[PDB]
Amino acid sequence: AIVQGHNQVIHQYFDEKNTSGVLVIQTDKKINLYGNALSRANTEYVPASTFKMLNALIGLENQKTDINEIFKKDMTLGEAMKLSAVPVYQELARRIGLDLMQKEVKRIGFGNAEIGQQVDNFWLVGPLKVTPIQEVEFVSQLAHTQLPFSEKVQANVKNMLLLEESNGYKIFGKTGWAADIKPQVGWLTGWVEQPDGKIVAFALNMEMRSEMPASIRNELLMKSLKQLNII
Ligand SMILES: *C(=O)[C@H]([C@@H](C)O)[C@H]1C[C@@H](SCC/N=C\N)C(C(=O)O)=N1
Numbered sequence: 001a002i003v004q005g006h007n008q009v010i011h012q013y014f015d016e017k018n019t020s021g022v023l024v025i026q027t028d029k030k031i032n033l034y035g036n037a038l039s040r041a042n043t044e045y046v047p048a049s050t051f052k053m054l055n056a057l058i059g060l061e062n063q064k065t066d067i068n069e070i071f072k073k074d075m076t077l078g079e080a081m082k083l084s085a086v087p088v089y090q091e092l093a094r095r096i097g098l099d100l101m102q103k104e105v106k107r108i109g110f111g112n113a114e115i116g117q118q119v120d121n122f123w124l125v126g127p128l129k130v131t132p133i134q135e136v137e138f139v140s141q142l143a144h145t146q147l148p149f150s151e152k153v154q155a156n157v158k159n160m161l162l163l164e165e166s167n168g169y170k171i172f173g174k175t176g177w178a179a180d181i182k183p184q185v186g187w188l189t190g191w192v193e194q195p196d197g198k199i200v201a202f203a204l205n206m207e208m209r210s211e212m213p214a215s216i217r218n219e220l221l222m223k224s225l226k227q228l229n230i231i
Helices: 008-015 038-042 048-061 077-082 086-096 098-108 132-143 151-160 216-227
Strands: 002-004 021-026 031-035 162-166 169-178 184-193 199-208
Touching (some): 008 216, 021 038, 031 038, 038 132, 048 086, 048 151, 048 169, 077 086, 077 151, 132 151, 132 169, 132 199
Antiparallel strands (some): 021 199, 162 169, 169 184, 184 199
16 A cells, blocks of 8 residues: 555755655655655654644643744744744644654554654754654644644644645645754655645655755655656
């Protein structure tokens, strides 16, 4: 059920950036693998900023914040979803607390579900790790309102993840970059809502280097989605 797709062209997209990457695509429970390092799909990596999605779900579900709260630029949880915003989501993680965080991460079963003893950095340097296949499954469940959280909480977090609209397609997702571990890990995890309402989920995972532009992840994602006729 998890197979290499028609990967002739996309393999070369990653080769031209001289790095190792995988793109996982999930349609209705069919998963296909693309890129030039397909073994990455079942390899565990720190989630980095992609964990903000689950942090937000947990914080909103447990009424540790709400979508209108202004965190002292002064900004909301949703505004902070796009930005670096280490202070907002670190503050939210401290409000949740280590015990509730570990309980929720175990209930969701996210990755290896281990968060250690420091509630405000376990997603960046370990010990929490997750595979790209696990990330695409998680975000597919979010997109379909199938996670075990309030429907309204899931809708509110989805609304924070809109990256852009084009020609009737909506692209939702979340970037991550673990720059302080070696090798560095880059993420772009999300989904496409096609004009007729169909959902196609993706998880891009690649080795980063410090000279790369952050936009390299979106660049590779968009050219691959176009080649696959997903957009
Ligand atoms: C999450 O992955 C990042 C922080 C919150 O941990 C957040 C910030 C930027 S990375 C900043 C450094 N750039 C290169 N080393 C980011 C991202 O671009 O995905 N996410």
